[PDB]
């Protein structure tokens, strides 16, 4: 149950039941980034 | 082993100053002032003499005097280190004092024409903390001080400013504002406003009649209300059962009359006599002003409760004029104070249970201006059923046209105007009567075996006679018991006798009136 | 050193005395001696047995008694009073070593043992505390007014070096100020460093607000309050509204920057807890055979009916109805397409001064899941569902009424006749469909409201009118009234003999309060076991009687010209028979139970009728 | 350089305990959950669900306190309101 959560269960897998009351709007997060340096013009990439 | 802090206390000055007469040429001198206390805070520690450690070197500087602000040392004592700004505080090895803040208000009789009351903040230290309660008249002796005030930035006029002199400095910006307000720091707090006579009173065997004839002397007649008010000032007994059921021991009275009757003089008498009493009116009072209100401290970190009429009348009598102009919202709080003796606060995330052990004196106008003798009591009043049930005595004042009574009444009224206060000659004075009431409240009567069986038959007499304007239930039996312990306290004895049961029964039966019917 | 040597302090203060290594070793050895050399009156190893029950449940906390430590070794008691913070670390290491000495490899099943002092002489009220009490052991009373959730606190912290990607080893957190590192041993740097959440071990944390109990506050003054911090096994013990006893340490919050903050230099205080104590329906195989034994005594029904409100005089019919609705029945689903409820509703209609609220109070102390709401008053719970904002956390919450909160239990509505339209709609929905619907703030849902209703109401005017039917004395409507099984009418009839006993009882109460019965404690548990495991049966040999009884009561009702009789009356008959049978922990509904049930419904119908109809019926139905 | 980058979707949800088996007189407690990619827009408020996830913390009065939250790894709905 939701009230039976303690310090033991931290970085561990739990199974929970309940009711949903909120759902926010979808946000954008990056997965692949391409960048450039504003002074010398060096280019590289990033993967998340 | 540390040294003991010493405090000096002066008192008994020649003159006492009013709050509306404080000037700025008396700053930093000794004076005594008067006022009424409204709000108090909890006791917190105060930094007095601190220990600091250097940050360039690690040296220890102890016993730095703070003097109303957070002062830091201005020179490392080592002749080598040249530190003057960088320090750290050892909170483990510093010496503290006790600190409380009190709020005061101007007394009612000292307010000028057309103006509103003034306020002032009082600081207490050491052993003077927790001597002032809310709703008290106290005299303070202390020193008139000034504290910073950033609320004045915006007022018209020239506001003084500070700067450093650049004439004399060799060269090849710190302006501070001088705005202050007047505050007060106290060293002495006092709350202001023989057996031979008491033992003489206890003996006289007409003491009850004299006490009745000493109440509200300015009012003419109306002896039933005078008896009721006395029994309400004396009180009953508070009991508790095995199951935690609480048996109530306060008497609640309601006086019913139209705007013609002299029903507000009774209330004004009680608010002038009794120790802890408050006078409130129906449409000049809000719910927060009756129960309580929550305000936040400037010091930060805590909150404070501010008392209302019901809390300022704890173990006392609350006076309400014009009970019929009360709202349902206020009446649900009054009912909570009457069934329970608690007030519940839930606002802004604060939960608190507060004590309201108070009696209710209330004056109500008939529903249609005048009292209809053909209707029942319920038909003439405008109260919620829960509130009406828990009132003990209902007194109705009706007018009669008799010539001799009119002559007496007119004589009395004119006498008071001609002769000032030499028109009363009461049996007892107010200072005499307070002492007797205080003595009487410390007796705890018990019932006797004759009393039990007399009560049973008196209850069966009431019930058979009621089969009217107000029907008889078990609540009336409990009211009978309460009134019995009230009369026993009036007689200053320790056990109830069947004679007092007769007076209680007669009083209750007389308070009831018969409904008039046509034909 | 020796024990009488320690009692000559040779330092500036107690704190600096206790931290010297030589005095710490001495006190650790002397604590080991206390642990392994105690003996009670008889001589039993008081702490030996506690340390073996430590093994079974595998707990992480140990209870110590200050009286014993004052008995044996007094300087330790003085140091415990003055500087408990330093003492408790030493005392907790000693306990852990002693436990390992009796349970090997317990450092895995648990890594630290906590000491909690049980008794302690001086007890303070919250208003007495002053600045002389700072950093000292205290014991206080109060009432719990607020509670927070469980947050994790750092215990064994691991750091990352963001140049060479290394995990720096366990570092300990003192519960005073946050710890920060400065040196990487592998790459030799003071660069950026961040805590590894995944490899860290945390601790339980919760905060509570304690208020002076209203009763003790001296006249004219207001209650004071303080804050309490609970760590590890102490979280979630005292729910709001209870009275507790706290043993802990009185400290200052080192607020922040004392600079700025113009004004006097004042500080705030907290209490850090060590032990909490309070100042049930679960049963066992010891009491089960006693249940079964009491169940075999003929006439358990009338014992139960007289063990109910054990402080209101007379009113047997209402007590019988209370027992019936406090035991219940069997809900039914016929192949997932037809439902007949199990709970039995009870309405009380009575004149002012007949003790209905007292029975409603009793039901709440006697029951497992019971909730209280008021129609026209001030209560901590309403009847309508809603979405509101939490003052503390600043969050939106879904809250149901007392009907939803009391699922599989009982709901107690006081002053039933003064409801507003909203409460009436909620009540009707709950009683009819047994589920609450809400469409607010994007939430569309249906909730379960399988609850029993008991209600109290006052007639119109104030007194009962016997010359008119029930529907014309009360302000409720037939749709709502028809959803109640049993109706009780309390009439204040002026009878000379009854007043004698009523007044006798009432006066005896006051006289005694001056400054058959089954015990309630067993009844409370019998009620839960019976309603958990007892599902009585309806074998149909006993169908012939009820068919012909219903036929007669239908033929009579139309002839006399009164309320109609519908099959809801027979359904109530059977549902009440279920309860009377379940009273005997039975296995097959008897005919005796059916006959007992029949009286309740027939009496209700007969007594809720006009005077003339009532005289006709009280003679016609004389056989039942 | 935004025209050369790729993105995904992330959502926040709050779960509440069943409003029925709650302590009497206390506000229900709730938890904050995070999900992304192929788990978004799968539920609506008012639904009773089974969630499998990881219990973790993030930093947001007290010496060292952290706020818990759950990373979603599965969703299963008891039954939906048609
Ligand atoms: N039959 C009775 N036996 C014992 N005590 C009784 C009885 N009838 C009334 N009382 C007592 O009389 C008082 C009645 O108060 P209570 O609020 O319980 O009555 P009520 O009928 O619920 O009130 P009301 O209908 O006026 O709102 C209580 O002290 C109660 O214990
Ligand atoms: Mg009631
Ligand atoms: Zn570059
Ligand atoms: Zn220095
Ligand atoms: Zn490194």
Short mmCIF file of N, CA, C and O in Angstrom, two decimals, chain C residues 16-61:
data_model
loop_
_atom_site.label_atom_id
_atom_site.label_comp_id
_atom_site.label_asym_id
_atom_site.label_seq_id
_atom_site.Cartn_x
_atom_site.Cartn_y
_atom_site.Cartn_z
N UNK C 16 32.96 18.59 27.17
CA UNK C 16 34.40 18.44 26.84
C UNK C 16 34.96 17.32 27.71
O UNK C 16 35.89 16.66 27.25
N UNK C 17 34.38 17.09 28.88
CA UNK C 17 34.76 15.97 29.73
C UNK C 17 34.38 14.65 29.08
O UNK C 17 35.19 13.71 29.05
N UNK C 18 33.17 14.56 28.53
CA UNK C 18 32.71 13.28 27.98
C UNK C 18 33.44 12.90 26.70
O UNK C 18 33.47 11.71 26.34
N UNK C 19 34.02 13.86 25.98
CA UNK C 19 34.63 13.56 24.69
C UNK C 19 36.08 13.10 24.80
O UNK C 19 36.63 12.61 23.81
N UNK C 20 36.71 13.23 25.96
CA UNK C 20 38.08 12.77 26.10
C UNK C 20 38.13 11.25 25.93
O UNK C 20 37.26 10.55 26.45
N UNK C 21 39.12 10.71 25.20
CA UNK C 21 39.09 9.27 24.91
C UNK C 21 39.08 8.37 26.13
O UNK C 21 38.38 7.35 26.14
N UNK C 22 39.87 8.73 27.15
CA UNK C 22 40.03 7.92 28.39
C UNK C 22 38.71 7.74 29.14
O UNK C 22 38.50 6.65 29.64
N UNK C 23 37.90 8.81 29.17
CA UNK C 23 36.60 8.81 29.91
C UNK C 23 35.57 8.09 29.04
O UNK C 23 34.70 7.51 29.62
N UNK C 24 35.67 8.13 27.73
CA UNK C 24 34.77 7.41 26.83
C UNK C 24 35.00 5.91 26.93
O UNK C 24 34.04 5.13 27.00
N UNK C 25 36.26 5.48 26.95
CA UNK C 25 36.55 4.06 27.13
C UNK C 25 36.04 3.55 28.48
O UNK C 25 35.45 2.46 28.56
N UNK C 26 36.25 4.34 29.54
CA UNK C 26 35.76 3.95 30.86
C UNK C 26 34.26 3.72 30.84
O UNK C 26 33.77 2.68 31.31
N UNK C 27 33.52 4.64 30.27
CA UNK C 27 32.04 4.58 30.32
C UNK C 27 31.58 3.48 29.38
O UNK C 27 30.60 2.92 29.67
N UNK C 28 32.27 3.20 28.30
CA UNK C 28 31.88 2.08 27.44
C UNK C 28 32.02 0.75 28.17
O UNK C 28 31.12 -0.10 28.14
N UNK C 29 33.15 0.56 28.87
CA UNK C 29 33.33 -0.66 29.65
C UNK C 29 32.27 -0.78 30.74
O UNK C 29 31.71 -1.87 30.96
N UNK C 30 31.96 0.31 31.40
CA UNK C 30 31.00 0.29 32.53
C UNK C 30 29.59 0.09 31.99
O UNK C 30 28.77 -0.45 32.71
N UNK C 31 29.28 0.50 30.77
CA UNK C 31 28.00 0.19 30.13
C UNK C 31 27.91 -1.28 29.77
O UNK C 31 26.84 -1.88 29.90
N UNK C 32 29.00 -1.87 29.29
CA UNK C 32 29.00 -3.32 29.07
C UNK C 32 28.71 -4.05 30.37
O UNK C 32 27.93 -5.03 30.39
N UNK C 33 29.33 -3.67 31.46
CA UNK C 33 29.04 -4.24 32.80
C UNK C 33 27.56 -4.05 33.17
O UNK C 33 26.96 -4.92 33.76
N UNK C 34 26.96 -2.91 32.91
CA UNK C 34 25.54 -2.76 33.22
C UNK C 34 24.70 -3.70 32.38
O UNK C 34 23.77 -4.35 32.88
N UNK C 35 25.02 -3.81 31.09
CA UNK C 35 24.23 -4.67 30.21
C UNK C 35 24.28 -6.12 30.68
O UNK C 35 23.24 -6.79 30.74
N UNK C 36 25.47 -6.62 31.02
CA UNK C 36 25.58 -8.06 31.26
C UNK C 36 25.66 -8.46 32.73
O UNK C 36 26.00 -9.60 33.03
N UNK C 37 25.25 -7.59 33.66
CA UNK C 37 25.24 -7.91 35.12
C UNK C 37 24.00 -7.40 35.85
O UNK C 37 24.17 -7.06 37.03
N UNK C 38 22.82 -7.35 35.24
CA UNK C 38 21.64 -6.94 35.98
C UNK C 38 20.80 -8.13 36.43
O UNK C 38 20.87 -9.22 35.85
N UNK C 39 19.99 -7.90 37.46
CA UNK C 39 19.15 -8.93 38.05
C UNK C 39 17.96 -8.30 38.77
O UNK C 39 18.14 -7.40 39.59
N UNK C 40 16.78 -8.80 38.48
CA UNK C 40 15.52 -8.27 39.06
C UNK C 40 15.39 -8.75 40.49
O UNK C 40 16.37 -9.29 41.02
N UNK C 41 14.23 -8.55 41.12
CA UNK C 41 13.93 -9.09 42.47
C UNK C 41 14.28 -10.57 42.44
O UNK C 41 15.24 -10.98 43.10
N UNK C 42 13.54 -11.33 41.65
CA UNK C 42 13.81 -12.76 41.56
C UNK C 42 15.23 -13.02 41.08
O UNK C 42 15.87 -13.99 41.50
N UNK C 43 15.74 -12.16 40.21
CA UNK C 43 17.06 -12.31 39.64
C UNK C 43 17.08 -12.53 38.14
O UNK C 43 18.17 -12.66 37.57
N UNK C 44 15.91 -12.57 37.53
CA UNK C 44 15.82 -12.86 36.08
C UNK C 44 16.67 -11.83 35.30
O UNK C 44 16.73 -10.68 35.77
N UNK C 45 17.31 -12.21 34.18
CA UNK C 45 18.08 -11.30 33.34
C UNK C 45 17.14 -10.39 32.57
O UNK C 45 16.71 -10.71 31.46
N UNK C 46 16.81 -9.23 33.15
CA UNK C 46 15.83 -8.35 32.54
C UNK C 46 16.25 -7.97 31.13
O UNK C 46 15.43 -7.94 30.21
N UNK C 47 17.54 -7.70 30.93
CA UNK C 47 18.01 -7.32 29.61
C UNK C 47 18.42 -8.52 28.78
O UNK C 47 18.39 -8.45 27.55
N UNK C 48 18.76 -9.64 29.42
CA UNK C 48 19.06 -10.85 28.66
C UNK C 48 17.86 -11.33 27.85
O UNK C 48 17.97 -11.62 26.66
N UNK C 49 16.70 -11.41 28.49
CA UNK C 49 15.49 -11.83 27.79
C UNK C 49 15.05 -10.83 26.74
O UNK C 49 14.53 -11.23 25.69
N UNK C 50 15.24 -9.54 27.00
CA UNK C 50 14.94 -8.54 25.99
C UNK C 50 15.85 -8.69 24.77
O UNK C 50 15.38 -8.58 23.63
N UNK C 51 17.14 -8.96 24.99
CA UNK C 51 18.04 -9.18 23.87
C UNK C 51 17.76 -10.51 23.17
O UNK C 51 18.10 -10.65 21.99
N UNK C 52 17.15 -11.52 23.76
CA UNK C 52 16.76 -12.72 22.97
C UNK C 52 15.43 -12.45 22.25
O UNK C 52 15.25 -13.02 21.18
N UNK C 53 14.46 -11.70 22.80
CA UNK C 53 13.31 -11.36 21.97
C UNK C 53 13.67 -10.37 20.88
O UNK C 53 12.90 -10.22 19.92
N UNK C 54 14.80 -9.69 21.00
CA UNK C 54 15.33 -8.92 19.88
C UNK C 54 15.57 -9.83 18.68
O UNK C 54 15.33 -9.42 17.53
N UNK C 55 16.03 -11.05 18.92
CA UNK C 55 16.36 -11.94 17.81
C UNK C 55 15.15 -12.37 17.02
O UNK C 55 15.18 -12.40 15.79
N UNK C 56 14.06 -12.72 17.71
CA UNK C 56 12.92 -13.32 17.04
C UNK C 56 12.27 -12.35 16.06
O UNK C 56 12.16 -12.64 14.87
N UNK C 57 11.79 -11.21 16.55
CA UNK C 57 11.23 -10.20 15.66
C UNK C 57 12.31 -9.46 14.88
O UNK C 57 12.01 -8.84 13.86
N UNK C 58 13.57 -9.52 15.34
CA UNK C 58 14.70 -8.93 14.62
C UNK C 58 14.62 -7.40 14.64
O UNK C 58 14.90 -6.74 13.64
N UNK C 59 14.23 -6.84 15.78
CA UNK C 59 13.99 -5.41 15.87
C UNK C 59 15.32 -4.66 15.97
O UNK C 59 16.37 -5.25 16.21
N UNK C 60 15.25 -3.35 15.75
CA UNK C 60 16.42 -2.49 15.73
C UNK C 60 16.44 -1.49 16.88
O UNK C 60 17.24 -0.55 16.86
N UNK C 61 15.58 -1.66 17.88
CA UNK C 61 15.47 -0.71 18.98
C UNK C 61 15.44 -1.46 20.30
O UNK C 61 14.87 -2.55 20.39
#
